[PDB]
Symmetry: C3
Subunit: 665 residues, 3 copies
């Protein structure tokens, strides 16, 4: 076979995992929405793509959302000019669909499980309380002169009121722009200026993992260079003394106490912008999502990819500064009317048992996190997870990067006790909602495979050299989409040329994701890393996931990243950055001996061309807060270009860049 | 042996029950009542409007009574505790469309407003067409000033018919009007203009009332020196006397409106978009906020049922639009129903005290609605001004704003109604939006001084004020509360929701607290006998202001009285009475010491030994607001020697009376 | 002995009636007319559109012809006396949705605009898709400037196809466009920009017309020195020649639109929201049209007066600065979903064959132009038209002034080859759409007669001295309308008093057009000139059209204008300005002899009272850019008031005023 699965210690013939009994409607669990096999998925999926799928999408849109005005046209526009339209004549409001309609049905149902940084401070927030708080904030924003179409910046940590802030903007038709709490003043400034908001919402301080985030201090530094911001609303999260500017800055509780606890919903066109979300090369990229298609995509993917039922308690452990928090903490779960988790802490605070204490306390029915969190808990030891119950879980999700089969198995074995479906969800900020993922009651999974495209997604593999679609199976190339889908990003804010050039020009007629992909002999899709991260060794194309998956098969390896660099003989050579577990004895095992064994492991599993030319042992890797490993930073450092690096002040650990610069020289 | 007594009356109780008269029975060609013919017909309909199955009735009434651009789905939600009351939330409508356009499309030449000018010879009818055209011109002017949906607009206008055009022009574009009584001082106007943060003010060059000039533009000029946000003033040329105009800021209404077309589209408003702010007559000005659909529905239904309004009716509410009574029962209620409404620019006694009745016979008014202060005023002026009029076009006479003493009630019944009209005593507040407790005139047999029974949608209880517990059964007295939200309840206090919750929702959690004392007699009739703050406690006996004042006016020659409490060592509190005799009363022939002695015995005979005033002060007038409320708080603080902590009293009806009362106490 | 005579013609009356030709009878492969085949078929349909039972017809047409977001309840209300005209008041719609989106959703690649560039080789077809995308980009740009619903936007654009996108971008967001003829002077532009109080102006670097450069940005910069409210100028790069650009205020159209997405939601407009202000050419008069009635009127008149069918290619050769361009280039044709021509050139550039080269190249099915253009081509000679095909044409239209029978016949003979119906369309900026015109499939035409009123128009003739309606036929007086019609102008911008005084006060209960009119014995209507231009000779009333029609019957006459002046004996005396063809030899032919024959011709055809007291031979006449002859200018010069003429800097050829002033003295 030309296309191989990601390296695993399990043989292939024992590596196919059918939907487990918890996903078969047994042991009292709800029956899956799609099942019980691959054919039930394909039969439904075929209704959602092609020239006869308008019927299905119109019905789903009218069944799933409450509309003030019906639409006439299902879809229009396209990639070439970036004029994508879905349900254009309809009107609706996102806050109405996420709060009001559920509040009118069951006001005391829990909307948010607020898991505070200190576990003892956690509590449930009802739909009634969340709707009231949202309306008070919306009334405060209107009193500042915020109109429909105005942008509002949000610099809030993971406290439950962050959802009220998002939905207050949606309620009045303002465009929220959320920035990770803890981003530097410089990074915050650039995003506040780019979206041209006149109002910013923040906290006095944030609390994450027992550490204080000095959010109001950062905000004051940033706003000295933000001439459009006239009002700042400050939530008193810690009560520690912070500066407040007379006139400009007001306390959230004091402002909201002035306002009634209901606010009318602005009637939004389907294509009115809902939010701007800046990704984390050059200027910040503000990805713009509209209202109806985005909301529909998040609601349908939540329902089908995680098999959400009305009583479920959905635990997405990500941050609302990330698209994962937008779609699968706030918009998806609340549109469906279920309970969603807002997790304020880290996976290891107070201890690495935190995730599993949370699951057993609240009886979470789904858990959703990133491979970086999974690898972190994998390296912390089985004592923190082995003696928990965790049987309320039916589905475990992974998002943000390829999941190494080694990490996949740890997730499957300890979090799921081999009784949960594992959904590896591939998508991007620009896709709005999950693009490729197994439907858990239908798809038999392979460790590290996203499996099959979601409803409305018609994806292909293109040879990057020819620009032509590769038909059949056992093919590898770059991932593209043939047709628009409801939740696709509509533009890059005030930079539509960047939007067309990045996604629509490389392969005209297609959407270009920017990731390498392979379709194996069974038709399963494998997303093996960024196209920019592919290493070309003597004409052999190497993906980062396969080498990193091979490296982590060696004992004591916690996390790795591989990058290419120009080589005189092979064009490019592989350089590995390897993080061993801190307990690994670097004196008993020689670094030169460990590097040799790692290279042989890569050679044994992939081939002679894949063996790293050099291996660097580092204590950690440069990562974004969402958990993405910044291989571009490592690649430029290896190239001796530690000067041409972009904005690195808001990465997870800025100091690790210094350690990497040292170890290379 | 009854714990609860009717307000003191010279008529014995056995002859003091007044069944709906023939004009309210569909006889003599009068329209058949909407509800009747008895108490049970009221309860039968009322029971559909409260309780857990009342959504059906309210949804049907909402869709039958108003024109909507978009239908609602949800009937009601929210509640008292957080102040998130919602009615018909997904619906959209426009108040101006419901008060003007839909009636104009059906009968453009029908009279919308009977404009009774200060001089009777200048009175005229204003058709729906003309009112709609003027409203649209003003709305276009406001839009040309940059007024947007949700912006507040202050209105400082006297009772000329264009005041209705100004209100409805704001409603038409979704602006929030804030009307201030014309004649309020520059200080009171300033405080309200600044609180609502408006950028536009609408006023007149001058007002005319009772042959006197109100220097409105002068007051406005003085106020705006401390109102830095107001950028545009639109000035109506009511008198044409020369007034200063500030270049740029001030423009003439007629010149601005001549530039604009006579139609303007209606802004499609959410049911819960704010319709207006109305500042009430203690501390900082309280801007009571009403939303759109529930408020409009409440005014339309109360006008229809409490006054038994029919399509050809000519409704004469004689109040001022600076008052909630003018908002609800001059402009929004009558015009929403598509009938004719009166805008009365004068006083009850100008040129003579026959003015009200000349008006009724001139225009054939079918209902008259006024305040007890006006009724007591006309009672004091003599029967020659009323006895020889016809007045037979009237079917219903209403009283609003304070308890009506049975003595005044009977005068109203006897001379205004010639014992052939139903008398509707309507209890409500600015915060309730529309009438809360009132007799339905074709159904309820009235008792002088009783509001009788709660209106549709109002589920009221009597609570022990200390324990918070409901007093079940009849013959109980305590404080009035409502159990559930109703469509027209005020939604907030502007930018001060904490004050709204603390005032109405926090004192008795789970209820709306009106602030008035109340009693339910053995027949179940409700008696609202005064504000809770005005109750006097003499030796453990709770005394209401209405009962003592009603006993005092039973004495011959008494025009009007007010009673307040003050600290007493032996009885806890003692009663002090301020008494206004008719000026024609001979105070030399009757000794003042004898008159006070006769008054005390009259009180003792009717109420009990404990109720006799410890001291009585004879005054030429009482401290009253413009709407006629007697300011007992002012009198109480003066008696307690707290004439330093009175507050803003510059815009009361007669500011000088405070000087006479302060002198007379010492 | 008829009191009312047809306009003077060289054809006897008995041979001057032209039934619909075979191309308008459904023969020779043409589509069957919407109304036909005779006068009774017109009356039968017309009678449904007027009177107290016509609501049914108008409600149905409104719902059949336009797409609505919200239905209306009331058909019509209001009236002339106070200027509160209302049509479909509760309805909501958007003009850009009706002219672009709904056609784009059906056939995106269909040509919306035939862009006939000033140079023929640069002409091209613009699809509905391309036009909608450019409209949406511009709308997004305007929104980014803070333009809100109800804001005025000035447009100073020449006849390039993006002018339609600029109009429709304003309509899309509910802004009120105010278009000013490109080439109007800085003073005339300044006055219109200041009157509408716009904060945004859209223009070009330069225009190109007849091979000449219009220095639009230079004119704009001079104007804006006296326009303190304008904050943003959007500049279309039409020529790329260097022009001044003011930092901050001025931005390039292509650079701004490249930042914006190619779709924009439609603002839901009430039927009576203003759609545009159009200043006519004392203080400038900004005529205001609302949305639904205006759009319905233009769509119905285009369909019925020009018998437009879905595949037709409609060629209106006027300028968008004129109401004719508003109604019959942009709004009418695009509302109907057909192809419309945007003609950037002049009728004689590069040569006088331009119109007919255009018709044969694009196979135009209808042609619409002004009598001044027809008279211009008539003077240029038959060689430029005689050898063209032109058989794709079915209907030829004339708009803007009376068409002399001599010019009518030239149009009929050479443009139409006696095989097209000629529609003489009478209307005004204030009427929105055609008022009186033959329906080409039903009405037999007379040269110079508008014939019969359009649907919804109930017109009468009033004796100006008595104010009374003249019943019956063979009557002459002033034209009035009895009832409002859907597309009537609703006000004069911020000058409603001028609106009432001009149109509604002279004859209370009627709309006063300002034109003299006669109804002949057959019931045909004749519009013979403005009331202000009527000449009173010894108590005999003379219209300009009849004398000007008689003068052009003389050989060598290209164009004439007749005006009155104070006379001691007759009250007023006739003065004629006559333009001979430039090839006419004024040395071989005595001017005194030519003047005598011209006077005798008038005496023979009209009578002794009409014979000009003086005749002036001029090389050209003072005309507006739309082609109206400025007889008010000529009258004041004859009266010796050549100083109090007012603003004449933006007329077609301002220098000709100097030549006329010389020749009179
Ligand atoms: C309505 C109105 C104007 O509203 P507002 O000015 O808010 O005054 C509200 C207060 O007026 C008093 N009041 C009003 N009507 C009555 C009545 N029929 N019987 C007894 N008291 C009455 C009470 O004290 C209310 O709380
Ligand atoms: C249309 C248009 C442009 O509108 P506008 O530029 O407002 O000019 C309006 C005036 O033009 C004259 N006019 C226009 N068309 C004709 C015609 N077919 N026959 C006779 N006269 C006509 C009249 O005098 C109108 O009142």
């Amino acid at each position: 076979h030309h296309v191989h699965p990601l390296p695993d210690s399990v043989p292939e013939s024992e590596d196919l995992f059918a939907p487990p009994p918890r996903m078969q409607g047994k042991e009292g669990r709800p029956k899956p929405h799609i099942g019980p096999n691959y054919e039930s998925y394909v039969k439904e999926w075929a209704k959602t793509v092609g020239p006869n799928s308008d019927e299905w999408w119109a019905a789903k849109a009218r069944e799933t959302l409450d509309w003030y005005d019906d639409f006439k046209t299902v879809r229009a526009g396209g990639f070439e000019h970036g004029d994508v339209q879905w349900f254009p004549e309809g009107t609706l409001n996102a806050a109405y669909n996420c709060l009001d309609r559920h509040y009118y049905k069951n006001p005391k149902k829990t909307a948010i499980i607020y898991e505070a940084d200190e576990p003892s401070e956690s509590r449930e927030v009802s739909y009634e309380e969340l709707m009231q708080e949202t309306c008070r904030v919306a009334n405060v924003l209107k009193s500042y002169g915020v109109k429909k179409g105005d942008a509002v910046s949000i610099y809030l940590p993971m406290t439950w009121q962050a959802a009220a802030a998002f939905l207050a903007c949606a309620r009045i038709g303002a465009i929220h722009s959320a920035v990770f709490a803890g981003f530097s003043a410089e990074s915050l400034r650039d995003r506040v200026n780019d979206c041209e908001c006149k109002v910013l919402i923040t906290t006095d301080e944030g609390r994450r993992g027992g550490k204080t985030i000095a959010t109001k201090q950062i905000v004051d530094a940033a706003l000295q260079q933000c001439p459009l911001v006239e009002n700042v609303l400050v939530l008193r999260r810690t009560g520690n003394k912070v500066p407040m500017t007379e006139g400009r800055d007001k306390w959230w509780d004091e402002e909201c106490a002035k306002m009634p606890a209901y606010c009318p919903c602005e009637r939004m066109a389907s294509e009115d912008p809902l939010f701007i979300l800046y990704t984390s090369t050059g200027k910040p990229k503000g990805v713009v999502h509209s209202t109806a298609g985005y909301l529909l995509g998040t609601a349908l993917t939540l329902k089908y990819v995680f098999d959400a039922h009305p009583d479920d308690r959905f635990a997405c452990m990500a941050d609302i500064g990330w698209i994962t928090g937008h779609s699968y903490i706030i918009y998806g779960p609340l549109a469906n009317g279920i309970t969603t988790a807002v997790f304020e802490s880290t996976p290891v605070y107070p201890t690495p048992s935190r995730y599993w204490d949370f699951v057993d306390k609240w009886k979470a029915t789904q858990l959703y996190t990133a491979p970086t969190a999974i690898r972190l808990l994998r390296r912390m030891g089985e004592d923190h997870v082995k003696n928990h119950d965790l049987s309320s879980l039916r589905v475990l999700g992974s998002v943000g990067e390829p999941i190494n089969p080694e990490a996949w198995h740890w997730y499957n074995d300890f979090a799921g006790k081999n009784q949960c479906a594992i959904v590896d969800t591939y998508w991007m900020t620009e896709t709005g909602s999950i693009s490729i993922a197994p439907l858990p009651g239908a798809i038999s999974t392979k460790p590290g495979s996203a499996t099959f495209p979601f409803f409305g997604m018609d994806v292909d593999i293109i040879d990057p050299q020819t620009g032509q679609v590769l038909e059949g199976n056992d093919v590898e190339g770059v991932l593209v989409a043939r047709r628009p889908w409801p939740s696709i990003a509509r533009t890059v804010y005030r930079d539509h040329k960047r939007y067309l050039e990045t996604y629509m020009k490389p392969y005209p007629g297609y959407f270009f994701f920017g990731d390498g992909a392979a379709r194996d002999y069974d038709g399963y899709m494998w997303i093996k890393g960024r196209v920019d991260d592919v290493i070309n060794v003597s004409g052999h194309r190497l993906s980062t996931a396969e080498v990193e998956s091979a490296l982590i098969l060696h004992k004591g390896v916690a996390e790795t990243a591989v990058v290419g660099c120009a080589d005189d003989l092979t064009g490019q050579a592989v350089y590995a950055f390897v993080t061993m577990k801190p307990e690994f004895d670097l004196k008993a095992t020689k670094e030169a001996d460990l590097s040799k064994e790692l290279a042989i492991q890569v050679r044994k599993v992939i081939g002679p061309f894949a063996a790293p030319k050099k291996i660097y042992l580092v204590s950690d890797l440069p990562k974004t807060r969402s958990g993405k490993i910044m291989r571009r930073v490592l690649r430029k450092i290896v190239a001796g270009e530690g000067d041409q690096l972009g904005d690195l002040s808001s990465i997870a650990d800025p100091q690790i860049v210094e350690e990497v610069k040292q170890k290379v020289t």
